Ligand binder design. Structure first.
Ligand SMILES: [Ca+2]
Ligand SMILES: [Ca+2]
Ligand SMILES: [Ca+2]
Ligand SMILES: [Ca+2]
Ligand SMILES: [Cu+2]
Ligand SMILES: [Cu+2]
Lengths: 721, 718
């Protein structure tokens, strides 16, 4: 018995193309590029013949395949994109089994309690030195695989460490005063609490809402204001902003302004309701899904790699032209790029031990009741890894991409497989270099970049991160921002209405009765670069115009002030794109005697206005609790437990436990293991072109080899000597 | 019959044979053809075509009729190019018009025997008539005219000819102007050096044993108010030399501290400057792969099997909601004109004309062979003339369409540049996306149309991309690659004695070779007409203000908005944290906001950014080119103000570019404005850029700002 080709292949996730003239089917799926003619006894997979006992059968124009076609073809082995790992990499994320194992260990402990939730279950970082000897020398890690289990017992956080090898509990430590991040059940809880509240229902009714069941709530962190917001620091609270569901698939376009409920999650009740002036709910339908639009006509455009990919994925290790790296997922920060090396003519040179998103913040600038406290710690308070958005094949990533699946732990301790969690794709990026000497044959080569892309959606905002490995040693890190804007309901319909001026003091009027409140997206990346080795120093090279003292007609010259940045405190700074900042290896030089280095560029450009620091007066608390928002470059001594720019438990934090703390002691950065942190962001002043849905806006950052090599890096293998 | 491979390859089409399907896939620019041996039909961009003569398979080689190419590629099924029955008024001079304009000036009694042509281009009808032709099909009713700038010896003459009526309209000698460098000046300089005993002598002293291996490079010398000892009236060129060692890269063998000054009318060296003798770096440093072997790679193709989404009618390009005209100029290259955005059936004005305005590459070493180095690339060398033909699949992606363009050479003879510009659509990530939790995802792909042009000037190769986004945004990026201009030095490593002094003005990129620090400063002249001719420049500076509304916050995020009323105020530094708009005060979108375009001179770059001119305000190059120290400029529209550096920048003594255009500080309120964006790089070299430099890019953007009433790509409402 057989099945219908088209339906089965689409279900499977493969692209199916029929060519009536050639009587040929082209099937595409990740690294597999297949050709199959109806009735043929053979098929082609990445340029290679594959025998078929059961040929594709074309009936009354319907094609049918055998029930094993999918596996016989796609898992044949002719697609060599994915290979089996022999010796398990020490940085491999916890498997579904280990996740279950770690949860059983803790649930067997005498102190564990039944409603306990899990904010994070991740592999406990094996020691850096052993992981590199494994990557570079293949030495086995002789330490037991362990896992960090962060639990939320009601509102109390407990940190445990389980030994997975020996299956035992190593520690159980309650962490006083820390608040846990927001977990998925919190969302349903806030909704129900709102729905059962008689007073809220009454507040909504006096705002024109008739059917209280149509109210959509959203749970937001409240921050910390030393009590001026009149909130008890010890309670587990969330503020609640609501919208009216009108059926256009976008409740975000119908804000109920000036109504804020404060919910205490352990008490399961609304403990406070702030109300302001009544503003009619914008009711116009504003769908962004295309339901009310005409589908244009566009001709097909496909990027194809008919013989397979240039990279190979073994376990979680990716090898691609001279680069080698390990890629894993973390429920809080998303992807982690590790043990990154560059093969230089046979020798693998270290470039970066571990790289990932650090954290990010989205601070709003309106003082009203529904906005003064909005300053979202996306990853820290919401868990971006858990909120990963599955890639939509050919739209969110190019058609020649390979989509990876990743597994992490959900809040109850159960393994969760996120489909299409990360896209990996090679891409043409113009000429690598070119020289057309006049009268001579031209010289040009193409530039290839290997992109690792991951998307996370937090409520209304969708963030995209691309880790870009250029064949020449360069590494780019870009962040894209799209989604739906958080808007303010207002009475003005046009800038000509009486309240226009005041309605738009904190934002642009992007639709009738709707204002896109100004805010910023500030991202921070934690990059543990190891420039050709562990011991590095921070070097400054500032281009300057100095008076000429060499004679001849010129009055000035272009020279450079070169100096080392010796400690953490002076390494914490603003970045002038006119200058050069390097992470050099004072122990190793290139062929010309210069220290092998990487130039750090926290600001390479963007399509939205740039944030030059957080837009807050120095006396605001969000400005105090968090220091990472004001400097674009930070450099700290390596430490296994310093990974978040906003600190480990930022929800209602009262003091900086992040980059402000990691550099507070101002340690020496001279010839030592350094860790680089880049902060870049946008200042978002809205426009009508961004509603109902926002076009993707991007920010770029770069890491370039500076005298790390001796010559143009992609010139090619030397034919002589 | 004729061999298929041979004929197709001669034609420039790519041929792929698939043995499994017994199918040939042939591709050329917008044609994507499929044909099986023996089939009575073929497919061209998804449509069936009857063949007179089937493809025949001989001794495993395919043969086709001798009319195959014509029948298949020119059958009409490839709709990329359409006939232009009514020529746009900005269409460049054709080869017949160039020849004709040349005859008209040659027929005048003032034409002198060996006159050369620095530029012969179209003298366009007025702006208004051109927009009425584009928007209402109204015929311009003026004769086709051309500007013919002549160089008689060293004297510049500007004439104007009427092509229809075949008559000379004007002949005006231009006093004090120095002409641009012409091709023949290249061979005169080498020849003059070759015959100079004094020069051969200096070269001998420097180690060179065979003076026939010396490669000259002619450079403009600027102006130093006489401090360089050069006569202002003489047509001069300075000459830097290199030794050819057979590695195909003379640039890697500088003959440091040797400069000859050649007087092109006298045809002789009029001064020789000599400094410390530095042995010429000799090690072979080829960049063409003669000494290399590339690693094998799996193939990648970008195909559009049903053809392109864009159409090219004459020079008019149509794509999506965009419409624009593309023409070529010998001096600045490509010109994008009559750009409009079709908003739900109505064409709205965006830009009347946009192009590179001018660029400069000034150096920062004070020494004898470098102090005067400040090349006006397009102005002194002619970037359009120097266009570098696109290497298909490499300088541009495999799904591009390459265009040929024609201009006049220095002797007035038409010259056709093959693959002078590439046009190509590309995938650029998700246009927008929203994955609401628990609901079906929403994502659309972003498509951009790029217009790419490459110009090579001596050792440096410049790439320009004019990028039209489907959503109305327009990007302009500039890439720099090529070979660096290096200084010979004695140090081999930073451990040698002179290393410190040898690197004061540049990095030691190779043994005995320093990449002298310099800047790359580009300027784009963009006559934007935001929804109409009359616009105003409005600033919007995001600022932190005290909260006066109550609640716990001490501050708020607000905007300081105010008009920039005059040219002087419009000439300014650009803070990427602020917003600058070119608004149409007479038109507004649905919410009542003035329709505008946000101008961003600085959207990023891969090399350090030029904060301004790395020159003290009293340097001559600083005074001659005010455009280099301000990233944004806005002037009132004037047909003869087109170059940021001025019309005749060779040995200029004062600013005749943007400095002169804004001089009068006129009003920019509600009038025809022209925006100029200056963007650049400060280039401190590295070993990774030798012997050949990895392309570095700079990015600029023009974004619709309340020009529309909602997301421009949602589509028309059902
Ligand atoms: Ca520290
Ligand atoms: Ca490090
Ligand atoms: Ca204008
Ligand atoms: Ca003016
Ligand atoms: Cu935003
Ligand atoms: Cu340069």
């Amino acid at each position: 018995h057989m099945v219908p080709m088209d339906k089965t292949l689409k279900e499977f996730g493969a692209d199916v193309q029929w060519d009536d003239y050639a009587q040929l089917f082209t099937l595409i799926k990740d690294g597999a590029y297949v050709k199959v003619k109806p009735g043929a006894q053979t098929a082609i997979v990445n340029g290679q013949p594959l025998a078929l006992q059961v040929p594709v059968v074309m009936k009354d124009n319907k094609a049918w395949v055998s029930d094993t076609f999918i596996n016989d073809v796609f898992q044949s082995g002719l697609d060599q994109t994915f290979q089996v790992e022999k010796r398990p990499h020490p940085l491999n994320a916890l498997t579904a089994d280990e996740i279950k194992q770690a949860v059983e260990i803790v649930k067997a402990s005498a102190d564990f309690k039944p409603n306990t939730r899990f904010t994070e279950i991740s592999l406990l970082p094996p020691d850096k030195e052993a992981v590199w000897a494994f990557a570079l020398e293949n030495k086995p890690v002789d330490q037991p695989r362990k896992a960090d289990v962060i639990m939320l017992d009601g509102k109390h956080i407990i940190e445990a460490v389980v030994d997975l090898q020996n299956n035992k509990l190593l520690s159980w430590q309650p962490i006083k005063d820390a608040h846990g991040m927001v977990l998925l059940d919190d969302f349903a809880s806030v909704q129900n609490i709102i729905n059962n509240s008689e007073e809220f229902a009454a507040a909504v009714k006096k705002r024109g809402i008739t059917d209280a069941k149509k109210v959509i709530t959203t749970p937001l962190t409240v921050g910390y204001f030393d009590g001026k917001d009149g909130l008890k620091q010890d309670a587990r609270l969330l503020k609640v902003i609501s919208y009216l569901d009108v059926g256009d698939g976008n409740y975000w376009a119908h804000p109920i302004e000036n109504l804020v409920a404060v919910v205490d999650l352990e008490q399961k009740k609304i403990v406070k309701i702030e109300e302001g002036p009544v503003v009619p709910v914008p009711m116009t339908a504003r769908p962004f899904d295309g339901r009310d639009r005409v589908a244009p006509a566009v001709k097909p455009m496909q990027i194809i790699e008919p013989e397979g990919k240039n990279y190979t994925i073994t376990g979680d290790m990716i090898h691609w032209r001279n680069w080698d790296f390990h890629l894993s997922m973390n429920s809080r920060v998303g992807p982690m790029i590790s043990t990154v090396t560059y093969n230089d003519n046979g020798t693998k040179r270290k470039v970066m031990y571990e790289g990932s998103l650090g954290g990010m913040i989205v601070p709003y600038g309106d003082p009203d009741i529904g906005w003064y406290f909005k300053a979202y710690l996306e990853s820290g308070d919401y868990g971006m890894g858990t909120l990963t958005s599955p890639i939509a094949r050919g739209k969110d990533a190019p058609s020649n991409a390979v989509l990876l699946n990743e597994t992490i732990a959900d809040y109850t301790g159960v393994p969760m497989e996120i489909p299409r969690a990360i896209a990996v794709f090679e891409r043409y990026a113009g000429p690598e270099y070119k020289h057309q000497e006049m009268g001579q044959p031209n010289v040009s080569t193409e530039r290839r970049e290997l992109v690792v892309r991951w998307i996370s959606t937090v409520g209304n905002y969708d963030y995209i991160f691309d880790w870009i490995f250029h064949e020449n040693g360069t590494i780019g890190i870009d962040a894209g921002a799209t989604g739906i804007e958080a808007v303010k309901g207002v009475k003005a319909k046009t800038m000509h209405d009486e309240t226009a001026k005041d309605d738009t003091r904190y934002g642009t009027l992007i639709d009738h009765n709707i204002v896109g409140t100004t805010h910023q997206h500030i991202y921070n990346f934690r990059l543990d670069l190891d420039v050709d080795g562990e011991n590095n120093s921070l070097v400054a090279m500032d281009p300057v115009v100095k008076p000429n003292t060499a004679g001849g007609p010129r009055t000035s010259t272009m020279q450079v002030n070169q100096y080392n940045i010796g400690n953490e405190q002076d390494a914490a700074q603003k970045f002038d794109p006119g200058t050069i900042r390097l992470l050099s290896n004072p122990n190793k030089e290139n062929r010309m005697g210069n220290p092998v280095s990487y130039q750090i560029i926290p600001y390479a450009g963007g399509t939205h206005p740039v944030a030059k620091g957080a837009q807050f007066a120095p006396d605001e608390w969000i400005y105090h609790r968090l220091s990472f928002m004001d400097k674009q470059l930070w450099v700290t001594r390596y430490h296994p437990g310093e990974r978040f720019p906003e600190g480990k438990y930022p929800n209602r934090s009262t003091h900086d436990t992040g980059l402000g703390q990691y550099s507070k002691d101002n340690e020496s950065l001279d010839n030592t293991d350094a860790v680089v942190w880049m902060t870049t962001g946008t200042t978002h002043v809205a426009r009508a072109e961004e509603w109902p849905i926002m076009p993707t806006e991007w920010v770029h950052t770069l890491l370039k080899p500076w005298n790390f090599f001796d010559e143009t890096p992609t010139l090619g293998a030397l034919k002589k000597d």
